[PDB]
Design a protein around this ligand. Structure first.
Ligand code: ICS
Ligand code: ICS
Ligand SMILES: [Fe+3]
Ligand SMILES: [Fe+3]
Lengths: 522, 477, 522, 478
């Protein structure tokens, strides 16, 4: 039943008595459900150290992973280039999922095509799909460039992307000069960030490998910036803002901030902004190339150093105070530009905020997960804030990265109780936050199910989620935030300290019970 | 728009295509004609998509794992293959359920074998067996496992049927192998069929000779309602108010035991024909159970369906049918009294999957709105037969529409509202056209039944008449 | 008792059994407390419509006001001028409170002096306090300017500021050319925003009244901007950023953003930035003067129009979509500069966010309070979002203002259930959110006590507070936010929609009870 | 660091002042000397502030309403005058209490008569009478009303005493007129005295003729603990573990009935001498109740106070005293073992109000820290007498320090930590000097007693040793 003046959606409609009784009868009548005492017993067991040890002995089963597959990153990379259509050679189901995943994080259109390979292509290959696909795509959506990656079907059957593209041009399906960079992006290798690296290196190679002979390092007086897999718009914008404030000439290679933020003004813009083909063709002439997320840009680094002859600086992701400091100082050294007073003042405002908030942050215990560069930057900034990152999980991390993070932890007293986990998923993390409870989780929207589980054990065991990362599906417009630079550190610090204070306010809101500590001033 | 105007639009849009695609797409676009009833005489469907044209379709894994099997709440469903498919589809579809997630229900979790290259080289069958044992130790209250195959499984020659039979016997557990690899078929649709056949072959016959369940003459099953935002619950409450006993829900909020009990019912009530007609046809062949299509979108269709369903039983049910109708009459009449004036005359274009593009027309008409275009991602010709009777004359029909086509049709037709999916939503909002998600209900609903009609009307009103649409143009241009 | 490795502060220390027993013994033994059943009965009574009727019959008693006194605004205005020391003639206790109040909101030093009038000055006036105070202040803190206001003591006894300052110069306590603008700021008239108006008009008169004959309107080709009482740093920054993006020459008169955001770099800066004396002397040569908050700049307006001969535009506070549009279009007409593409794109991104979020905002009911301009701008934006501002409270509002807001409400269907209250306090508002419960409150930190009260009735009656306004004491660094322009609208929209979604997540977090609606994607 | 260096520093700083201010401030700055015991020979205090020098002091209303009367939880306190004072002081001080706010407790609410110009012209006495009736209608469970006068009340010639007598009799309610107008005196201090006399004259004697209270030989009252962050509760727990019965707390978490019962106790335990010595002297004269000063900051002083207090009773209390001391010994020893190494040798400068500038020195010394400077906003000479015994030789003493003086002393002395108020905090953090709020405890605490020492130690360590202080200088500068 509904009252027309106060219509109820599913919540709280189905808490009405008649819906409750109906659901009780369905359960008792036909679901053959385990008794509630048995559910409570098993639930309690899943929160124990005994369960945790069984959980961490898994070798074959993955539960609630914290990573995606390569082509997702290849699509995001390709979207960063001017009037470029991402094109995934293989089965169309993949592309539907890629678009949906990004649609929900950015709340924006996400353009990507497939060439719809099916059962038959498994026997005779996908050459004809590529010829018709490229022609159809170019004629219909009029891109200036088509950037080709692959689904796992096309990888398993072994389609030769280079040969198929060359034949499409040879047989007249697309003009010979139309740019069709490509990369093999097998879902069973690495993760989505590997797909970004592979796509970018493919695009760099397409525009530079065969024209190196006229290139002179430093001749365009710019610094190349390679952002990697980046899903916060503010992170593209703050890097450009800081470099412009310094007067540093730069080329941001793969820049999707415009196409992921078009205005609602009465027309749909399939393409907007992006790195130009010239910027890629001219990139070898830069003074140097800075990689913003080096732990998933290894292949790009080898190409930039091996072919462009740039001496890629050893720089961490510019997150937090120290690593932003180091990024600016290296940019200053490469470009010969001094760090201006405006960035010095911004640094000091971040430090001022740190002094203002340090008493509420000190000793706060955190579980956190994400991609490798993001995670280690978050770890570094937490240590700078006097926080303890106790559970550090990177599903797509590797041994070398774990050693670097362990060295960062070892250099600080606030890392004494921290452990780094690689190859573990969020069902592993669920056990950790039960058996060694932190104060908060920092992670993506999939963490909301861990918070739900912890609350079911008890309010005193609940671990609230702070949403920082990718994907964020259950809040709006956090993709506009910033996590890099002093600006990003300021935003993260504000989110952390106010999450702490929101939770304290919740715990002290009880009249005549805990509100003796419900302070007006904090 | 006039018929001839609509035919010229189709030709205008098709001019951008290369010759091969143009000749193909012309066959998937048509204008409804009341003198033409058989769809096989005016539109083609359920064929391959043209490469590179940005179809909205998914794959057979989406149709099997995401749609049919995934909602079954007390089973664990294994996304068998690389990590991607299970992650993108994790909790994306709002197939609601009651349970303790991680303990006795598992719907919004993502279980996967996370294939690495070694699994490609040596095969994944030993990993799958090891995986099943790990599931058993960590999730003891699961009541069965399904193995949803992603693209590589069939391509490397794995034999999940054999693993499922061997491990099933060793553990005395229902383990369902499903060969729903995404390269099969042309869309989600073949995934429906594959999944229906896996239910039939591996689950549905478990209680064929079992006689334990006490039947009544009023036992029914809801077939093809996946309880999006609770849709199946707002349908079930009505059927049971009418005196029926809903033994099973396929598969929203569904349990494996409910499925196993379905061969015991007297009548199968089919909402989504596309996805479940296969198993409905099977149960009528093997068990003699009749099935009938029904429609709970909006008061007109819900009343019509309740009365048709009741006619299959006796006077006592038909009497209770009229009791339910009279009970809810003031409620939905108040909804139309409030919202129909705010929506009457507004024109709607729809593009959805395999059922809703025709099933929701009645609800729009109950609010005085007009559906001037509709189409399906993956429907077959029997769906289009049913659609032409529902759609008005000279309306536009599009099968497996391309991104380009949909945008160009909208620019010319200028609908007041569009109802489609997440990949379309943000395109048309930027064009200044109110948009409602007609898969996820835009995180609202339910929309089925009398209680859902109130929410449906509220939602269309809030979006169509929202102040934001008057502001797209800056006053200085 | 304490365990050294997990030390407890007051919360949760005093929940230990021994403290709990001690406190029960104190209560029962010596507090002669009303029995709990009587407390519960009276509390329930305070939530009824009968209590509300008595509550709204108050004439003499004010409970939990939502305003402060004039000198607070005079101090904030004075801080916006270069190397200017605020100086409040009267009793020192006032200055301690003004500084502490702003310290707690901005988490920054706040410099202000008193001349410490006592019982003796109450009989014979504070002339000697002024002579020594001005001399002491100039020698010790070396300001370029001292801006003088009054506490209520000095107003009641009638100290003539003009005469006292002239005599201080005549007798040699400060140089005659040293600038000492002044304004009478009686606490028993108006509110803190009136003090801002009075101080600004005093400073404007000091630098322009006697030199008008060489002034020519429009000759410096700039627009003056008067911000009024403003406690968000982002609001100063967005106005300057937008006008610079337009290429509009401008003078921001009273600009405290620098002195309220100095870096922590090892030195304390008593002064930073601010409007220069030259800019004030030259202001009459501007094209026009725009008042960002006209409902508390009445006196300033009369002076700018009567003496500078500027035809001040009739503009609402630039909050939300329509009023930011109108602001930019009027600035464009005055300056002859077109609205640039960057601002048009920012507008369209705000509209995009509105379309993205409109389904969660539609119909949401809000109680809100603040100063008149801020409140009416918040009302206007809520109506643009399709929200319902049901309880609109402005303690320091007036009848003319209430009529303007009622006209804004009448122009929209979403104003149908709204009532505007003037002269009511937060104890009045408490009754309204019990008897006509909204979904959320938008207000300052004092609202936290209302949220506490509503929860005590029951979780289903709790009205969460969304912190927007002044002062905010129990979260950190929200004074850095923006509420003006498209940027401010974007920030407000994001805060609102995610407050809605966090509350829905809370209500649907219950395992097997309400988590059927605990959606990953919203 | 040496005496001669400190004295020259004083003269250097004073050179900026005009002649009159220079001569005055010179009298309020001094260097401790163990050969001089009487402050009446080396520092002046409790004089008016010099105009325009940015004193940190407040007013008499702050000392009466903000400090003494405001914490009393079951009374309603009216800020009588314009809207400002009650708003700036609303819930600014963390005088903690247990109650149902708005129903039976009222501490964090702001009740005011919100004076307008008409009230200035015609007087506010009729408004006050109407206000009292409105309070009684809307807050029926209040157990008394106080009227805290703001500046204009005395200047316009209102007679709140007459209103209080008339309405009090009419309503059979305790209504306390307090003439704490901010222009009286020179600081918060006179507000204390005014407020103490109002307690004496209008509340304390209500039960002089009552013989109902069941007394014991172990009845005490805690005088001058305002329960900042729960300080009084972590003090009370120790006294009652020692076998005493704490009948009243003045005024943190205090009820009017506890106040009225205090003349029935055997001993008044005075923590804050400055604010409550007046009423304590009164109760010794009128009721014969002895009073004694104590100190619950840090284990050394807490142990010393427990034993001195216990010595005033019998063997059973003295035995329980040693039981309590032994109980908590492993606890505070574990705190010292952990935190003293992290703090030993660090130098602290304090500037607070009227008690803590001397009372917390022992707790710092229990962590191996040294207090190299201290001073008061509004102390009297008897406070500075007690201070000379606590402070080390050649340390710097400052009375009613100016903003300029404090900044310049810190620049030269370079303390490792500063403990002062909200108006000082953000100045010194910008200079890169760790800062702890020693009024509000920086929203932490309690700091009293054994349980408070653990929090105090944690708090000093987390701030002194925080990583943020290493980062003030950008590496390209630097
Ligand atoms: S199953 Fe089908 S695409 Fe019948 S695959 Fe799809 S929850 Fe659609 S039109 Mo998403 S044939 Fe259901 C459908 Fe309809 S996922 Fe849902 S809304 S009624
Ligand atoms: S009452 Fe006094 S200024 Fe003794 S007015 Fe002040 S809560 Fe201070 S040094 Mo704030 S004489 Fe108490 C004090 Fe000390 S408000 Fe508190 S910390 S022990
Ligand atoms: Fe968007
Ligand atoms: Fe600060």
């Amino acid at each position: 039943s509904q009252q027309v003046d106060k219509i109820k959606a599913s919540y709280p409609l189905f808490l009405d008595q008649d819906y409750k009784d109906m659901l009780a009868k369905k359960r008792d009548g036909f679901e053959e459900k385990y008794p509630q005492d048995k559910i409570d017993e098993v639930f309690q067991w899943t929160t124990t150290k005994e369960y945790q040890e069984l959980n961490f002995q898994r070798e074959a089963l993955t539960v609630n992973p914290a990573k995606a597959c390569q082509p997702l990153g290849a699509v995001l990379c390709a979207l960063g280039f001017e009037k470029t259509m991402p094109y995934v050679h293989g089965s169309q189901g993949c592309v539907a999922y890629y678009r949906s995943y990004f649609n929900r994080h950015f709340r924006e259109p996400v353009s990507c095509v497939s060439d719809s390979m099916t059962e038959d292509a498994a026997v005779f290959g996908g050459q004809q799909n590529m010829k018709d696909g490229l022609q159809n795509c170019k004629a219909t959506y009029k891109p200036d460039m088509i950037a080709v990656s692959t689904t796992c079907m096309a990888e398993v059957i072994g389609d030769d992307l280079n040969a198929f593209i060359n034949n499409s041009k040879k047989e007249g399906f697309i003009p010979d000069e139309f740019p069709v960079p490509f990369a093999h992006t097998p879902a069973f290798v690495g993760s989505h960030v590997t797909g970004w690296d592979n796509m970018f290196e493919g695009i760099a190679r397409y525009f530079t490998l065969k024209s190196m002979d006229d290139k002179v390092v430093g001749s365009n007086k710019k610094i190349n910036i390679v952002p990697g897999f980046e899903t916060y718009l503010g992170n593209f914008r703050v890097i450009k803002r800081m470099l412009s404030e310094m007067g540093v000439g730069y080329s941001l290679l793969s820049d999707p901030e415009e196409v992921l933020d078009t205005p609602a003004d009465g027309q749909f813009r399939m393409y907007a902004g992006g790195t130009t083909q010239e910027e890629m063709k001219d990139a070898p002439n830069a003074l140097n190339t800075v990689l913003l997320q080096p732990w998933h840009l290894e292949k790009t680094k080898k190409f930039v150093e091996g072919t462009w002859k740039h001496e890629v600086p050893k720089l961490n992701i510019p997150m937090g105070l120290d690593w932003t400091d180091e990024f600016l100082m290296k940019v200053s050294e490469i470009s010969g530009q001094p760090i201006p007073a405006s960035l010095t003042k911004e640094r000091g405002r971040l430090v001022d905020m740190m002094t203002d908030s340090h008493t509420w942050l000190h000793g706060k215990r955190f579980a956190l997960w994400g991609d490798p560069d993001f995670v280690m930057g978050l770890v570094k900034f937490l240590l700078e804030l006097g926080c303890e990152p106790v559970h550090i999980l990177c599903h797509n991390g590797n041994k070398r990265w774990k050693k670097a993070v362990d060295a960062i932890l070892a250099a600080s007293p606030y890392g004494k109780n921290a452990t780094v986990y690689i190859g573990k998923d969020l069902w592993h993390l669920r056990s950790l936050v039960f058996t060694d409870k932190p104060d908060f989780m920092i992670g993506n929207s999939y963490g909301k199910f861990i918070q739900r589980d912890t609350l079911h054990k008890g309010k005193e065991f609940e671990v609230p989620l702070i949403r920082i990362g990718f994907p964020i599906f259950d809040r709006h417009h956090l993709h506009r935030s910033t996590t890099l630079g002093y600006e990003g550190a300021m935003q993260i610090l504000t989110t952390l300290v106010n999450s702490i204070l929101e939770r304290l306010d919740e715990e002290t809101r009880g009249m005549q019970a805990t509100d003796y500590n419900h302070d007006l001033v904090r | 728009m006039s018929r001839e105007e609509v035919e010229s639009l189709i030709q205008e849009v098709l001019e951008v295509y290369p010759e091969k695609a143009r000749k193909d797409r012309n066959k998937h676009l048509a204008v409804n004609d009341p003198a033409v009833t058989q769809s096989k005489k005016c539109i083609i469907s359920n064929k391959k998509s043209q490469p590179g044209l940005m179809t909205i379709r998914g794959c057979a894994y989406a149709g099997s794992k995401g749609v049919v099997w995934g909602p079954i709440k007390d089973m664990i469903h294994i996304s068998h293959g690389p990590v991607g498919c299970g992650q993108y589809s994790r909790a994306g579809r709002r197939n609601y359920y009651i349970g303790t997630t991680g303990v006795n229900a598992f719907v919004t979790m993502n279980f996967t074998s996370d294939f690495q290259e070694k699994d490609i080289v040596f095969g994944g069958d030993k990993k799958l067996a090891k995986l099943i044992d790990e599931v058993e130790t960590l999730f003891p209250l699961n009541k069965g496992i399904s193995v949803q195959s992603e693209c590589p499984i069939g391509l490397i020659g794995d034999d999940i049927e054999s693993v499922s039979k061997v491990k099933g016997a060793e553990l005395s557990k229902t383990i369902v192998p499903v060969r729903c690899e995404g390269f099969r078929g042309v869309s989600q649709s073949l995934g429906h069929h594959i999944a229906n056949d896996a239910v039939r072959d591996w689950v549905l016959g478990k209680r064929d000779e079992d006689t334990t369940f006490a039947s009544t003459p009023y036992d029914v099953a809801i077939i093809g309602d996946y309880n999006i935002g609770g849709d199946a619950w707002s349908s079930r409450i009505l059927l049971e108010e009418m005196g029926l006993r809903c033994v099973a829900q396929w598969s929203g909020d569904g349990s494996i035991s409910e499925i196993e009990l379905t061969p015991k019912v007297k009548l199968n009530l089919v909402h989504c024909y596309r996805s479940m007609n296969y198993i409905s046809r099977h149960m009528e062949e093997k068990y003699g159970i009749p099935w009938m299509e029904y429609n709970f979108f909006g008061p007109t269709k819900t009343i019509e369906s309740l009365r048709a369903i009741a006619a299959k039983f006796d006077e006592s049910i038909q009497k209770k049918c009229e009791e339910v109708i009279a009970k809810y009459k003031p409620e939905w009449e108040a909804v139309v009294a409030k919202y129909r004036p705010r929506l009457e005359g507004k024109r709607v274009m729809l593009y959805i999957g395999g059922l809703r593009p025709r099933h929701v027309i009645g609800a729009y008409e109950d609010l005085g709105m007009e559906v001037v275009g509709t189409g399906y991602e993956f429907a077959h010709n029997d769906d289009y037969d049913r659609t032409m009777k529902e759609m008005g004359d000279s309306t536009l029909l599009y099968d497996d529409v391309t991104g380009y086509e949909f945008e160009e049709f909208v620019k010319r037709i200028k609908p007041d509202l569009i109802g489609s999916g997440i990949k379309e939503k943000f395109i048309f909002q930027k064009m200044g056209i109110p948009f409602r998600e007609m898969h996820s209900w835009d995180y609202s609903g339910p929309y089925h039944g009398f209680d859902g009609f109130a929410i449906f009307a509220r939602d269309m009103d809030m979006t169509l008449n929202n102040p934001c649409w008057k502001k797209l143009q800056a006053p200085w241009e």
